[PDB]
Amino acid sequence: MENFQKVEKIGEGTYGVVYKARNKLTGEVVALKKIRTEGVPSTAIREISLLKELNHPNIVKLLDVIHTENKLYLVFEFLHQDLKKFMDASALTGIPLPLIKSYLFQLLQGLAFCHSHRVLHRDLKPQNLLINTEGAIKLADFGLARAFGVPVRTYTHEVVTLWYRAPEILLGCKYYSTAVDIWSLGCIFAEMVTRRALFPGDSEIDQLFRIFRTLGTPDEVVWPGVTSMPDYKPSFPKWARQDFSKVVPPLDEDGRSLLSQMLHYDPNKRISAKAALAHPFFQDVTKPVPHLRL
Ligand SMILES: NC(=O)c1cc([N+](=O)[O-])c(Cl)cc1NCc1cncnc1
Structure with missing residues (x-):
């Protein structure tokens, strides 16, 4: 919900479900991973946020981390x-x-x-x-x-x-x-x-x-x-x-x-x-x- 249009489910990802989605705004195609469980530590959110800065040509870019009502969404650059x-x-x-x-x-x-x-x-x-x-x-x-x-x-x-x-x-x-x-x-x-x-x-x-x-x-x-x-x-x-x-x-x-x-x-x-x-x-x-x- 909010800015994303689901194109299809990519699979049962490691930490949760994964969808190929389009950002209605930017129009960009991305991989959206929905993470578990019913708490989601604030330590993880900080550490994860740190990874948004880890950019290299051989590392899948973490575009965004979105914490919301029992569920963490990770937005990644998409590769086919x-x-x-x-x-x-x-x-x-x-x-x-x-x-x-x-x-x-x-x-x-x-x-x-x-x-x-x-x-x-x-x-x-x-x-x-x-x-x-x-x-x-x-x-x-x-x-x-x-x-x-x-x-x-x-x-x-x-x-x-x-x-x-x-x-x-x-x-x-x-x-x-x-x-x-x-x-x-x-x-x-x-x-x-x-x-x-x-x-x-x-x-x-x-x-x-x-x-x-x-x-x-x-x-x-x-x-x-x-x-x-x-x-x-x-x-x-x-x-x-x-x-x-x-x-x-x-x-x-x-x-x-x-x-x-x-x-x-x-x-x-x-x-x-x-x-x-x-x-x-x-x-x-x-x-x-x-x-x-x-
Ligand atoms: N970053 C990504 O594009 C990506 C992320 C995740 N993920 O877990 O966040 C997964 Cl499974 C697959 C991905 N892509 C490969 C792929 C795409 N479409 C169909 N089969 C494979």
């Missing part, structure tokens, strides 16, 4: 498609390496900007990466997780995807660092390359064990302090690490090298977005035009 749908559509042929590289490079620029401004995403996944016809890709939902501590679910009994969760979160760490986003982005990079989710767990423990089966069960050597983590159990099975050549074939050594650094167990050893941008993998990065059908 997300990476999850694009990957499904490119399943038979695969996304061309040059485009995978362009997307990864752009997402790292976005993360570097967010992280330098002390903003974490915390829930990166293909569905939260939006793309347009110009070859741009943008991070969506940056900072919402913190302005709400822990998201948990959507609003209509939906199965929370754990596929992109960093191991420190799964092991009960209470303090997230910028490293959790690099881990999620690494999982997404692998998925674009192989056309299959890297760690498709269907429970928190299945997610953790899928990670362990591929990267090896972590220990104090590769991850100092891991055995003192909240949910770590000495009873975890001990699996040997597999070779990356087997995990993301036929990605080249530059790609495997970068991916391995994005998937280090120790959050402190995990590569930063800034450092990743300098990796030899991006020596020949370009900005291709995607084949997008809308």
